[PDB]
Amino acid sequence: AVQQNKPTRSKRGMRRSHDALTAVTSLSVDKTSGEKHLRHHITADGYYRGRKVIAK
Amino acid sequence: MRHRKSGRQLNRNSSHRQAMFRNMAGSLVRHEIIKTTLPKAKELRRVVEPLITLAKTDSVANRRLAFARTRDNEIVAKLFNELGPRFASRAGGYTRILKCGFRAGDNAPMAYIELVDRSE
Amino acid sequence: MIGLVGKKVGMTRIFTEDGVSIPVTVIEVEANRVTQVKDLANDGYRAIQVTTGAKKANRVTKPEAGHFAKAGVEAGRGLWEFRLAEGEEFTVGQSISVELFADVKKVDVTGTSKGKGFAGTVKRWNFRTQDATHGNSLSHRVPGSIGQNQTPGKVFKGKKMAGQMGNERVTVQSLDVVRVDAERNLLLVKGAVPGATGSDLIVKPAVKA
Amino acid sequence: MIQEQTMLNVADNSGARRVMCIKVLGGSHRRYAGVGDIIKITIKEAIPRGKVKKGDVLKAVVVRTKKGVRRPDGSVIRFDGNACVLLNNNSEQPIGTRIFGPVTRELRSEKFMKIISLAPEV
Amino acid sequence: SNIIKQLEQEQMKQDVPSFRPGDTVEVKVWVVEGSKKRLQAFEGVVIAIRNRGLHSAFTVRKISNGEGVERVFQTHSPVVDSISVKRRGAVRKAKLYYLRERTGKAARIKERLN
RNA sequence: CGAUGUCGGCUCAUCACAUCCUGGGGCUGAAGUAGGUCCCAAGGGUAUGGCUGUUCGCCAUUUAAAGUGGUACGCGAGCUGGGUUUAGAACGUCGUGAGACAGUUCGGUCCCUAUCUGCCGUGGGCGCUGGAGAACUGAGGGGGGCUGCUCCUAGUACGAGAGGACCGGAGUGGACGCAUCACUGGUGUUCGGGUUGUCAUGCCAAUGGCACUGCCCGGUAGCUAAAUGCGGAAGAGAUAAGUGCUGAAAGCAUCUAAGCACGAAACUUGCCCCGAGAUGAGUUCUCCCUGACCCUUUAAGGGUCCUGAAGGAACGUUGAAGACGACGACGUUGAUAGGCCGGGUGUGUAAGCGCAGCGAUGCGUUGAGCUAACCGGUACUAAUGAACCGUGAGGCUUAACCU
RNA sequence: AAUUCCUUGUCGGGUAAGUUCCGACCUGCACGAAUGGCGUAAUGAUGGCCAGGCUGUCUCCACCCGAGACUCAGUGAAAU
RNA sequence: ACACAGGUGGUCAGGUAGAGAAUACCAAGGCGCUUGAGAGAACUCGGGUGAAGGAACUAGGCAAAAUGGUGCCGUAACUUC
RNA sequence: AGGACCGAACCGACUAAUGUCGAAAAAUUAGCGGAUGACUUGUGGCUGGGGGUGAAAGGCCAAUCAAACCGGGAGAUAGCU
């Protein structure tokens, strides 16, 4: 249930191919406050679609 | 394989699942807005909505029924007296879901669930 | 012979006057609009291409609508091709209806079965379970032995093991057609066709005997 | 559904009380017996004066089934018990004459028409 | 959908007697004898009623000569002929399955007549 | 021999043909029928139980038949441990004894998270050479291929009588496989009700918590079989054994050397599924793109700013789609999901109130009350624009068509 | 037979079928009288057999509720 | 060896039901076990239910299932009574 | 009265599953046997390696038992690897 010969560092790297994270690239700037909030996510202060939504 | 199946387990047995919604609903009504995890928030939508629909009418039977579940005199008095008349006109949809951030410590997607009104 | 594209809308039973309860599926076969005809001259084979339904105008996109534009036919949900049987001839824009099947007695339904997902061999190939008790440890529904030994030293291609079951195009042949309604665009075939209620089916006459 | 090792209540005046099936006939590895089939039985409980005795082999036709049958309209006929009618192992004719309880309609074969006439109901 | 229901509503015979699961009912049913078509009788207790519109059905338990016989019927089949109720019983349950094992003494259903 | 680790059974198989069944033929001391024997033929099929640990074998009962073998006497990094080989113990026999056995008898630790090859599924990358959105072609590959019985013919051909066809047609079944919940049922710890014990709600009443869902009676949607439908095939081409035809060598004759016609579940197709990563990378239809420039080894080049389309992806509501990806619907010009409204279904007469009864309890209001995924509507709530990716006319050579 | 090789002895009971089981026979391969012999009520987490009851052990699995498995975030081994 | 499902002498030990220091629910009192969030595949582990048949499974009824309490009645062969 | 019966505490460890680099260098869960006696248990003593003790297996003697552990002769010897 174990290895037979150790895998090469080359074969090690190929297994790490599909491990890079994906960047966001969807930072919608708010209409009024202009924060860098994600789409369909409220801002850091609680603004969404140009509205004090959180009341906080 | 849950074809056409509803509900969510939320990694809990039924009794605990049910009892935490009994607590979460009353926690909402007393505060009108709470922060919770997103999947929990979506499942709360199928619980409080029946109660506001239960408060759109009023009787003694409904008062006992909304006391049958939710088990609180304070909440049932918060219900049937203010939330009912406040939502007398709306045909369903008494909750809003706002996705806040990410709970650093378990990376959970948290969200804000509140009443539609919240007029101050 | 050519066929049509319907939509599986539930199933029910039709009582006969003989008391024979005949279970039938209900298929709404809308107006099959022939989009484009291919020929031995241009393509290398004689066949037509049809469409049904109507997609949302703002949803249907440029190339497909432009494809629908040369045909001059109102847009539907996707296309389907049908090989001609050398002698029948239909032109672009002709609205094939369910009236074609009001002569036949056995049809063929091509459908896309329900998806069971990653299904075990017991559910996939109907393997026998190995004993529930009598000391059997940690092994009830596994397949067990899958090869011989050193002689083959490998696993043969086509071993029945676990995998994705369902969600695959199948075709039930020779279903007795019962009633062909035009005004309701309905087709009542005996039996049970593949797919969940609401899915799309290719219906065609029975090539088999 | 009757199978091997299935206890059957006797339904004639052949002289038995309890019989046990051993082998469903008609086809290799057939696993079930419906209302109009022949099965091979043994005798496990008999009256002291009957035509048969405890420990013989012969055939029967299972006339009543707790699973029941399905009529072509979809209706079912489920009895309370499992009853058989003994046969003659070569000529297939019933041994006893008087048959108790109802029988189904689907037993209506030319070779079981004798049983149809002797049954009281259905 | 509207398609199945239209297709079903033109099949249900619109003359069902509203019986109750616990009422003794005589059911008359057709029987074909090759060529000769005859009527056949059946009277027992209604122990289970299932409603699905066209697929609505009902089961009748009749203790025959010695033992019980249970039989279901497709309500909307042409095979049934007349479902004349005989006695309004008074039972609480919706499915009377305890009558499968309660014969003789306990098999007395209580008549309602209210 | 610095370990190839077990007899048989179980689950799961694959191949050979010296063929058990089914199929096609030859000959008889084959009348018919039903068999005997030999040849061709591997495609599918090829029991359930009793005793034994058994393989085997005997027996019982079936079946169209319950084939012989190779695969580390297939399979134990898949299970079991009965047999067999551990340390306990006893019987008989042999030995002075320790112990032993052509012997049998009870009990007795079966370890391993898969790197690679392999196999079953499912995606990402780039390429397919201008890019993108779809519909197919079809190389090639895989699945599938079993058969009993009854009737018509006919009780005819044949026969001494008794018996008793072939061939062709049709119906009805067993096993198996694919598919689907309309029916018959299963389950349904998210739906309704009953009820034991006990705690809390200040008490009674009415509810709620826990005791395996506390114990249970029913039960929608799904999933599902024991349920319900469907399939095997015909036919075509070229053949085996074999049957021939017309025919020389060999004036004859001869199935053959020339040629020619039939001839199997076998073979290549036909039937269903996968399938252009088939680098030989296909075809057709459609849509989009027609910038100013510097630069150098004037290179199918890069660089600067300007434009960035068709379309795509991400994000979001999500799904009879699904492990994760992927795939399908919709994203307000919107019915995608929740809620709501009506219906349906399921459970069986809520609570409160009023009457009668000593009371438990029963009756009226009430086929009520409450209803999870189901069905038809409804924007009440949540799917915000836009951004990001993707470009700017598509190398060279030759040839044929037009200046 | 806890002992019997030959052997699944032979006969009878039980079973549709019984190398095990119970009774019997006697050729006891190689029983035997305190290395105790033959029976024996009761008792036994004792060896073997049969029957009723009861059931998913099995025909043949089907569905559902939880803990992992799978995905995301943090930490992070092992034989070889 | 560890912030380890193990082991460790003596005293105290209430309410309801119950024979009981059993068990069930609770009081006093003490805690939610020191990784969570979603998903709701195959398969494994702990369990619930099952149509018809009911040991046919298997080395073997292994395991599960079932029986299970109180009062009264009644109770064989055999026996050291 | 009982080396009596059923059965918790306590003691023991027959069956099965899980575990097997485990939670644990023999445990957990589900059922089981004894449970006023040849019983069990706290504290403190006495018996020691070819000896101690043994309701007797050759078991236990500080996770070690055909003979403990520590140090010494001892760098034993090794026709073998």
UniProtKB/Swiss-Prot annotation, chain B:
Looking at the keywords, is Ribonucleoprotein present? Answer: yes
Fetch the Gene3D superfamilies from UniProt: Ribosomal protein L17
Gene Ontology molecular function: structural constituent of ribosome
Q: Which InterPro entries match?
A: Ribosomal_bL17 (IPR000456), Ribosomal_bL17_CS (IPR047859), Ribosomal_bL17_sf (IPR036373)
Entry keywords, A to Z: Ribonucleoprotein, Ribosomal protein
Q: Which Pfam families match?
A: Ribosomal_L17 (PF01196)
Cellular component (GO) terms are: cytosolic large ribosomal subunit
Asked whether the UniProt record includes Ribosomal protein among its keywords, one would answer yes
- Give the residue spans that cross the bilayer: none
GO BP: translation
Assembly: Part of the 50S ribosomal subunit. Contacts protein L32.
Q: Which family does it belong to?
A: Belongs to the bacterial ribosomal protein bL17 family.
Q: Which HAMAP family match?
A: Ribosomal_bL17
Q: What is this protein called?
A: Large ribosomal subunit protein bL17
From Swiss-Prot, chain C:
InterPro entries listed in its UniProt record: Ribosomal_uL3, Ribosomal_uL3_bac/org-type, Ribosomal_uL3_CS, Transl_B-barrel_sf
Look up and give the organism this protein is from: Escherichia coli (strain K12)
Q: Which gene encodes it?
A: rplC
- Which residues are recorded as modified (N6-succinyllysine)? K38
> N5-methylglutamine occurs at which residues?
Q150
Q: Which domain of life is it from?
A: Bacteria
Q: How is it modified after translation?
A: Methylated by PrmB.
UniProt xrefs under Gene3D superfamilies: 3.30.160.810, Translation factors
Name the Gene Ontology biological process terms: cytoplasmic translation; ribosomal large subunit assembly
Task: Name the protein family.
Answer: Belongs to the universal ribosomal protein uL3 family.
Q: What is the annotated role of this protein in its UniProt record? A: One of two assembly initiator proteins, it binds directly near the 3'-end of the 23S rRNA, where it nucleates assembly of the 50S subunit.
Keywords of the record: Methylation, Ribonucleoprotein, Ribosomal protein, RNA-binding, rRNA-binding
Q: Give the protein's recorded name.
A: Large ribosomal subunit protein uL3
Q: Name one GO cellular component term.
A: cytosol
Q: What's an example of a GO molecular-function annotation for this chain?
A: structural constituent of ribosome
What is an example of a Pfam family matching this protein? Ribosomal_L3
On subunit structure and binding partners, the annotation says: Part of the 50S ribosomal subunit. Forms a cluster with proteins L14 and L19. In pull-down experiments interacts with CedA.
